[PDB]
Amino acid sequence: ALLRQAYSALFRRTSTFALTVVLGAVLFERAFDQGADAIFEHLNEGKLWKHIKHKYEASEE
Amino acid sequence: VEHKLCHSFQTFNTSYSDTGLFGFHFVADPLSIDDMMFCAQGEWMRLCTSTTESEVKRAKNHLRSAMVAQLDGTTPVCETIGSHLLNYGRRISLEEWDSRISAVDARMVRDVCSKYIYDKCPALAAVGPIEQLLDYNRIRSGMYWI
Amino acid sequence: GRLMDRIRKWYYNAAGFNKYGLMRDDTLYEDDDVKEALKRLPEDLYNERMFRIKRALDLSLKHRILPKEQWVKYEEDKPYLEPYLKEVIRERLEREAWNKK
Amino acid sequence: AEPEHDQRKRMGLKMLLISALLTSLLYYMKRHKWSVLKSRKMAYRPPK
Amino acid sequence: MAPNIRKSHPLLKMINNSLIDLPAPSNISAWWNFGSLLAVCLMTQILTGLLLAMHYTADTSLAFSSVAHTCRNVQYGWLIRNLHANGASFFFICIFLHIGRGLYYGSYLYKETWNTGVILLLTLMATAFVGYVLPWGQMSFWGATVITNLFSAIPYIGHTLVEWAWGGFSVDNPTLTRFFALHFLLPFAIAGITIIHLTFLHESGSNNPLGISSDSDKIPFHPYYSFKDILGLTLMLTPFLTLALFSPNLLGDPENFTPANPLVTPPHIKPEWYFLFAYAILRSIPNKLGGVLALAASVLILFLIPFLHKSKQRTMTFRPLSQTLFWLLVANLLILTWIGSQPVEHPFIIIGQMASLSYFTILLILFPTIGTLENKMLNY
Numbered sequence: 001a002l003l004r005q006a007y008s009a010l011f012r013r014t015s016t017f018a019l020t021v022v023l024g025a026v027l028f029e030r031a032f033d034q035g036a037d038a039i040f041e042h043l044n045e046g047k048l049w050k051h052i053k054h055k056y057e058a059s060e061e
Numbered sequence: 062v063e064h065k066l067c068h069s070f071q072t073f074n075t076s077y078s079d080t081g082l083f084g085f086h087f088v089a090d091p092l093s094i095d096d097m098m099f100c101a102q103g104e105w106m107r108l109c110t111s112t113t114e115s116e117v118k119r120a121k122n123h124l125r126s127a128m129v130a131q132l133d134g135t136t137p138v139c140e141t142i143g144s145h146l147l148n149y150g151r152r153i154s155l156e157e158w159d160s161r162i163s164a165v166d167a168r169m170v171r172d173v174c175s176k177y178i179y180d181k182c183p184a185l186a187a188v189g190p191i192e193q194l195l196d197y198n199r200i201r202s203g204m205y206w207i
Numbered sequence: 208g209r210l211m212d213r214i215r216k217w218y219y220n221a222a223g224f225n226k227y228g229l230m231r232d233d234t235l236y237e238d239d240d241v242k243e244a245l246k247r248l249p250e251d252l253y254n255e256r257m258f259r260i261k262r263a264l265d266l267s268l269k270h271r272i273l274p275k276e277q278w279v280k281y282e283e284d285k286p287y288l289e290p291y292l293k294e295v296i297r298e299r300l301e302r303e304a305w306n307k308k
Numbered sequence: 309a310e311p312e313h314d315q316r317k318r319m320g321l322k323m324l325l326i327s328a329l330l331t332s333l334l335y336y337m338k339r340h341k342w343s344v345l346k347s348r349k350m351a352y353r354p355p356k
Numbered sequence: 357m358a359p360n361i362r363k364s365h366p367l368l369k370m371i372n373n374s375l376i377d378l379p380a381p382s383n384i385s386a387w388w389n390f391g392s393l394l395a396v397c398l399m400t401q402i403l404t405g406l407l408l409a410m411h412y413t414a415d416t417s418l419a420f421s422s423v424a425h426t427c428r429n430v431q432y433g434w435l436i437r438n439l440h441a442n443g444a445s446f447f448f449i450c451i452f453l454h455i456g457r458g459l460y461y462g463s464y465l466y467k468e469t470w471n472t473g474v475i476l477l478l479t480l481m482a483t484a485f486v487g488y489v490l491p492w493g494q495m496s497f498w499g500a501t502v503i504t505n506l507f508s509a510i511p512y513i514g515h516t517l518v519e520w521a522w523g524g525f526s527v528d529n530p531t532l533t534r535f536f537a538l539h540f541l542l543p544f545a546i547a548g549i550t551i552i553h554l555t556f557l558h559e560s561g562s563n564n565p566l567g568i569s570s571d572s573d574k575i576p577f578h579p580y581y582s583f584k585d586i587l588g589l590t591l592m593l594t595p596f597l598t599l600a601l602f603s604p605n606l607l608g609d610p611e612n613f614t615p616a617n618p619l620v621t622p623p624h625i626k627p628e629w630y631f632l633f634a635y636a637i638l639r640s641i642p643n644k645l646g647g648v649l650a651l652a653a654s655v656l657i658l659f660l661i662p663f664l665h666k667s668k669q670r671t672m673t674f675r676p677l678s679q680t681l682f683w684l685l686v687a688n689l690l691i692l693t694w695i696g697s698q699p700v701e702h703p704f705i706i707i708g709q710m711a712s713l714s715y716f717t718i719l720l721i722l723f724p725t726i727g728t729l730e731n732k733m734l735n736y
């Protein structure tokens with residue numbers, strides 16, 4: 001059971017609770033930022049310098 | 062004593078067939094209830110966190126005595142027996158009880174008290190001019206850290 | 208013409224404090240006079256008033272009221288303090304004007 | 309007139325997402341704690 | 357001696373008696389977070405403010421282009437700016453509701469707690485005034501030119517009182533500098549007074565919806581109201597950011613994107629929204645002095661409410677009549693505001709003059725009257 005397994009191992013000891021939040025935020029940051037940027041970028045395909053880029057970035061001369 | 066906390070306070074582990082009521086009861090002036098409770102719940106916490114070898118060594122010796130003093134005369138003994146068979150199954154001799162006690166040490170007390178006291182939602186009973194002590198939430202929070 | 212009566216009886220249901228099970232007097236704002244009045248209340252009529260409030264509060268915090276059945280009915284509202292208060296005021300007014308003499 | 313524009317909105321997104329989650333999370337906690345007072349029950353039992 | 361540090365320590369004892377063991381009514385509603393939120397605004401203006409001041413350049417020739425520079429060149433400066441600016445608005449929002457509450461639940465009976473409030477409000481208004489003049493845009497300028505001029509209405513000391521304000525004989529650099537210095541300082545004065553506001557309050561505990569002794573059921577500020585503040589924190593914090601992340605300039609006049617011109621008062625000049633209502637009142641009294649005076653009392657009247665309380669009961673919770681009046685008054689402002697945003701012509705002008713007549717009367721006459729009437733209907 002995860003809730004038990006979780007409460008018992010992480011949320012119980014006020015000292016481990018922290019490590020959980022820290023280590024957690026850490027993961028949370030990465031995943032979030034990645035998807036976020038993704039959700040955005042996609043909602044704007046072909047309009048960002050990330051898309052236009054190639055037409056001039058090492059293409060002419 | 063130092064801060065004239067309570068008129069009295071007492072520990073207790075009322076046991077039952079299938080359950081139990083481990084806790085404490087104190088009686089004090091309307092205006093200290095809080096500080097008191099506070100120190101108390103603290104002790105519990107300290108129990109589940111920093112009980113020392115010297116602390117248990119004594120308790121043990123204290124417990125042994127009551128253990129004996131419960132068997133002081135006829136009625137007392139008979140009671141113990143009447144209740145030993147009825148609840149524990151057979152009769153638990155003092156020689157036995159004693160082993161079980163010389164067994165217990167720090168680590169154990171910690172683990173055990175933690176086992177039953179740490180971060181558990183407790184039962185509260187208040188009677189009289191209790192304005193000063195308040196919010197279960199707060200009392201609850203007094204169940205962890207320590 | 209019951210006009211006046213028919214009206215008070217209205218505004219009463221209008222204020223609707225009775226939905227909290229509070230008495231008219233229960234709502235009075237506690238000023239220096241009332242304060243004294245309340246101190247004169249017989250112990251029963253007092254602990255009672257209090258509970259009525261501690262109940263009203265409990266409601267107001269839950270965002271609820273009493274089931275219509277337990278609402279206070281206009282004609283049954285007990286002006287438990289009105290008279291006490293009045294006297295208080297009277298006493299004062301006498302002390303007050305007597306110090307102008 | 310406002311180069312930032314894009315990032316302004318990209319953030320706006322993230323902001324909304326965290327704010328959706330965070331607001332929600334705290335609502336629970338606000339209630340959780342208040343439950344004590346919401347569920348509460350009392351009665352006047354004068355003595356006889 | 358004492359057991360738990362939290363109560364003995366000279367400093368914790370304070371954090372304690374005002375954030376943790378503080379006695380709060382069990383029933384205070386949403387309309388009770390506005391105090392704390394107001395705080396948060398203050399904290400957010402001072403923070404963002406120091407930051408903006410780190411890049412501002414109080415000086416006519418550069419004041420504009422410094423802000424511009426601060427938004428374009430300074431890392432996240434734009435975000436700072438935006439936040440500071442809408443913060444202002446959100447500040448006023450929070451404050452107007454904070455006042456609302458006070459009015460409808462007669463918290464104004466805590467006189468001192470209240471009077472200081474007015475003071476705070478007044479200051480905020482002043483503070484926010486100078487703040488705006490800083491960017492030195494068209495509005496910045498002309499607003500500076502009007503608001504200050506208001507004092508030219510006072511006889512004798514008047515024409516002089518302005519002199520100081522501007523530091524010159526017309527709104528020029530000297531003004532801009534001292535105004536910046538002023539704007540920089542003022543916020544702090546508020547912070548201070550707030551400390552007082554809260555003190556006078558703590559003498560009585562907080563009021564509460566029903567308007568009856570709450571001593572029969574109080575609750576430790578923590579965790580109850582503490583958690584409740586954080587929620588209310590994120591809640592407001594949302595539209596604020598939303599507003600400032602997706603439509604920064606929504607609440608803001610764009611005519612202020614045109615550097616001040618001491619020679620051309622924009623044809624369509626209308627005050628920051630949070631001032632509109634007053635703007636209106638003054639605009640309806642066609643007389644320098646009257647206009648000014650109308651405005652004065654338009655806000656100064658707050659100080660009176662405490663004496664214009666007649667109901668035997670404290671809050672309007674049980675006074676349907678008063679209530680209806682109250683809301684009418686809310687809407688009365690909501691109107692006055694509209695008018696402000698509308699040119700000086702017909703119908704607008706007359707509609708205005710009325711609402712203003714409206715305003716004052718609800719406060720000076722109907723309220724105390726519907727109030728008395730009210731107690732006779734309950735029979736007191």
Ligand code: HEM
Binds near residue numbers: 472553562
């Ligand atoms: C920087 C200024 C201000 C801040 C940040 C502030 C803060 C507070 C705080 C924290 C509270 C307690 C929480 C609450 O009841 O909302 C409070 C209460 C109060 N404030 Fe303010 N306030 C401000 C402005 C004002 C103004 C302008 C008025 C109106 C003149 C005012 C009137 C009151 C009153 C009457 C109370 C009592 C509330 C009650 O009945 O519980 N405040 N204020």
Ligand code: HEM
Binds near residue numbers: 405409489539541546
């Ligand atoms: C009471 C809180 C404050 C209010 C009400 C407030 C309001 C304002 C306003 C309305 C502006 C004009 C912004 C715009 O162009 O839209 C402004 C500008 C400014 N404020 Fe504040 N301010 C406050 C506190 C502070 C603080 C704490 C400082 C520093 C002591 C500060 C520094 C500045 C600076 C440098 C500007 C110029 C840059 C800009 O225009 O954004 N402000 N302020």
Ligand SMILES: C/C=C(C)/C=C/C=C/[C@H](OC)[C@@H](C)[C@@H](OC)[C@@H](C)CCc1oc2c(O)c(OC)cc(OC)c2c(=O)c1C
Binds near residue numbers: 485498504521626631
């Ligand atoms: C250095 C400090 C000094 C001299 C003190 C300043 C004192 C003034 C008050 O502060 C409390 C003031 C902010 C407050 O008055 C009660 C406001 C409601 C006044 C609102 C106001 O705004 C205007 C405005 O913004 C404009 O610009 C776009 C233009 C304006 O007309 C052309 C006005 C205007 O006609 C009024 C009445």
